[PDB]
């Protein structure tokens, strides 16, 4: 009864129903079984969680929960009252029950309370009823669990939801201790790893946390999340989680890129990984996803290979991308020789830049316009920079026969990137 698939749990523009349907379809195509609805900026999920869905919102949610069941995908509805709830006030608890009930009648069986990313104290009223913050959440969570009649799947996301976030440490936290103790055994606990965006999930970390949580956790995986960085996209393979974790977890739900179509790899390689141990090779799964993705788009598999390597993983570039970085660094470090070697590498380098240009022009000429659009700004960015980098390599080579400086004359605005934000960044060390 193991849970694997997607959480829509990011900040930003949420997906539309047509995307969420195309999503379910893909999940079943690849044998995943679960979807957690938790978009941070759908205002009635978090910002105004007390509020009931309007008439047209109701029709939409129902149509969607339909399609979930129609595709045997388990639909889990999340709610994030963490910000401003009064735990001790019962009218508050009533409002929360009335809200969850309203969703119950859409066809919704699975539920989740999330208490991620909120102030660690409570109001004067609560300090009386509850001995700690931890108590308060648990008390309200259980109350709901039972009110729902102990439903099929029911998730809880704690405030200390990863290693960094446990105070003062992971295995000595009052908060996580009391959760382990008091949260009812049929309620599952969500965990993101040792960090918010975990590079690696050691089995030892899971073991250490399972002992305090007194159960196996479902991972909220932020591996492919790109909401915290405007320039960042992650088309790399699912990686840094041993296949040997599967028996030791209740699930993994991936929180992926905001841009729906960018998540092909992110979801595929998670499928492959789950289906391998229901080892696994990141390099190899990547090969599999890129080939099968290439169908959906003129554009070559090599162009995709390049693209994935340019936007790979939060802590890693792809082979072809890391290569270009080293090469540019050497070329700039050893520029002052302007002797036999340097130029051939520059010629070779200006070539690899060409491949980025070509990758862009073919992607723009492609037939799948939805996919283009999700990525357009991301790939135009790399094209722009690569062309300036090609240009700068050219200029460095031309130093022996010219004393003109790199930018000549008056510049168009894209000579100087980033606007105000970029200006404040350059002032940090």
């Amino acid at each position: 009864h193991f849970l694997c698939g997607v959480v829509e749990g990011f900040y930003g523009r949420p997906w539309v129903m047509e995307q969420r349907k195309e999503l379910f379809r893909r999940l079943q195509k690849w044998e995943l079984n679960t979807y957690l609805y938790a978009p941070k900026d759908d205002y009635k999920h978090r910002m105004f969680w007390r509020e009931m869905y309007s008439v047209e919102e109701a029709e939409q949610l129902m149509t969607l929960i339909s399609a979930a069941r129609e595709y045997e995908i388990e639909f889990i509805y999340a709610i994030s009252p963490g910000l401003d709830i009064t735990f001790s006030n019962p009218k508050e608890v009533s409002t929360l029950k009335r809200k969850l009930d309203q969703v119950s009648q859409f066809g919704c069986r699975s539920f989740a309370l999330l208490f991620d990313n909120i102030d660690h104290n409570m109001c004067a009223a609560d300090k009386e009823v509850f001995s700690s913050f931890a108590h308060a959440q648990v008390s309200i969570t259980n109350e709901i669990y039972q009110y729902l009649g102990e439903p099929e799947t029911f998730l809880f996301c704690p405030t200390e939801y990863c290693g960094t976030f446990c105070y003062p440490n992971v295995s000595q936290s009052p908060y996580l201790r009391t959760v382990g103790e008091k949260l009812l055994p049929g309620i599952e606990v969500l965990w993101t790893g040792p960090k918010v965006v975990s590079k690696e999930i050691p089995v030892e970390s899971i073991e250490e946390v399972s002992k305090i949580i007194k159960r196996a956790p479902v991972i909220w995986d932020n591996i492919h999340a790109n909401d915290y960085d405007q320039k960042r996209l992650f088309l790399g393979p699912y990686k840094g989680r041993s296949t040997e974790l599967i028996p030791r977890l209740k699930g993994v739900l991936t929180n992926p890129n905001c841009e729906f179509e960018a998540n092909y790899v992110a979801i595929h390689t998670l499928a492959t990984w789950y289906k391998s141990n229901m080892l696994y090779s990141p390099q190899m799964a990547l090969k599999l996803a890129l080939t099968e993705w290439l169908q959906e788009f003129s554009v070559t598999l090599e162009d995709l290979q390049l693209l994935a390597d340019l936007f790979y993983l939060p802590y890693e570039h792809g082979p072809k991308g890391a290569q270009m970085l080293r090469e540019f660094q050497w070329l700039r470090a050893n520029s002052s020789v302007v002797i036999e070697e340097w130029r051939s590498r520059a010629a070779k380098f200006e070539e690899m830049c060409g491949l980025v240009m070509g990758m862009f022009t073919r992607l723009s000429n492609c037939a799948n316009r939805t996919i283009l659009y999700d990525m357009y700004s991301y790939v135009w960015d790399i094209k722009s920079i690569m062309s300036m980098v090609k240009s700068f390599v050219q200029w460095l080579g031309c130093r022996s026969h010219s004393s003109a400086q790199f930018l000549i004359g008056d510049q168009e605005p894209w000579a100087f990137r980033g606007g105000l934000a970029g200006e404040f960044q350059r002032l940090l060390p």
């Binding site: 900040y11 990313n117 909120i118 918010v196 915290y228």
Partner: peptide, 4 residues
Amino acid sequence: PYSS
């Protein structure tokens, strides 16, 4: 009051 967000992810960090």
